Design a protein around this ligand. Sequence first.
Ligand code: HEM
Length: 153
Amino acid sequence: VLSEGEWQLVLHVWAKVEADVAGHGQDILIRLFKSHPETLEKFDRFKHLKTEAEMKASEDLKKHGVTVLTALGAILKKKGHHEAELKPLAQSHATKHKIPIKYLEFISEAIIHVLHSRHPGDFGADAQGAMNKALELFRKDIAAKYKELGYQG
Ligand code: HEM
């Protein structure tokens, strides 16, 4: 469970992200795909992209980055009271998109890295640890739903 002070660190940096949701979403998905190419293969929508320049030029990838970060921002702003938001996300990601929990760890690392690059003054070690806790809580709660449905592994 995050403390109130931890949540404030998380949402303080997240308010900075929302100034350029689309740029963040591009950086995050590109980092994910580059660092963990098995993740790109899960997207029929994106798997034609073979270079970082092609990824950066894709408007559809930029659009999806906004979809992803909007859903995550809505979860973070619930400060842990996010059951209604995780149900459908866990259901689609386990049963339709077939995304292992480990890949959620990978995108969590990408999010932390890009927040660090873009917001160093609001993403010192305290805020990095708090965002890591928030993303762990996200993964923990999604993993419990995957387990329910027979997909935790
Ligand atoms: C912070 C973590 C994530 C969030 C908040 C998120 C959010 C979303 C949302 C809101 C959608 C559209 C609605 C839906 O299908 O549920 C979506 C679609 C999808 N997501 Fe995620 N996602 C996350 C992580 C991942 C990861 C790590 C992968 C793959 C490695 C992935 C793969 C997909 C795929 C394949 C789709 C469908 C894309 C399409 O063809 O339109 N997601 N995601």
